[PDB]
Amino acid sequence: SPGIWQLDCTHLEGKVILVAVHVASGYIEAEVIPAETGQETAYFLLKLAGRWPVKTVHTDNGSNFTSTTVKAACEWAGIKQEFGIESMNKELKKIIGQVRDQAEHLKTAVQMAVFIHNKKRKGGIGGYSAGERIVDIIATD
């Protein structure tokens, strides 16, 4: 299971942020999209699956199950879409608050937040970042 992810959205300044979490690591990827349309979700799944091993994507609701291009991205890349599973979305938003006045565009602040989340140590000291854990779980596999 180095290939299990959770996909959810969150909202900030009235724009949509897609969030993929690697469950076993807490590594995250995220992007501001211009609406919820299946167009962009599909594109971000394909991007994510070109980068990392993506085998199963868990979602919490039915929106991803009613989109033709997500179905086609899933199929082209060999991703199982699968129903049933947060505050990862809440801690993301704290860091977006700590950095928001360091960049003009919200989407720059989302990427600064992802950077910090991925590279920091739990507690601030010792052990691995999310970034190290995802590589260590895939390497160890």
Add this chain to the structure above:
Amino acid sequence: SPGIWQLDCTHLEGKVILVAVHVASGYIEAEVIPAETGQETAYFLLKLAGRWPVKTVHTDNGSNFTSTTVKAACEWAGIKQEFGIESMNKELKKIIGQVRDQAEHLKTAVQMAVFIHNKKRKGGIGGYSAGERIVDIIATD
């Protein structure tokens, strides 16, 4: 040196594709941008540096040295910009030709091309993909 990348652009259907190569692995990331502006290059560097260890980015010309937001992205993420160093751009374009009629948007075909490039074996058989090599070099570090 798990953190050395090459950054270049290539062109197709009159749109710009940014290309980051992890030199020791051949792993690639790429994105269609709406012009060459330092805005998008900076954003893609920040994205790339949130995902992987990015310490030094080599470029071949002076365009990245004259952009304020690239300078600011470099500085915020701790990336050394460094002058002096392809046909990686040419093999990318072969695969974009093999897949172009499977997606409406060129940018979907660029991501299908990156997927294949990153996950395939050299020869088609045995050894590691680019995706496995980048994780193996970072893990082994």
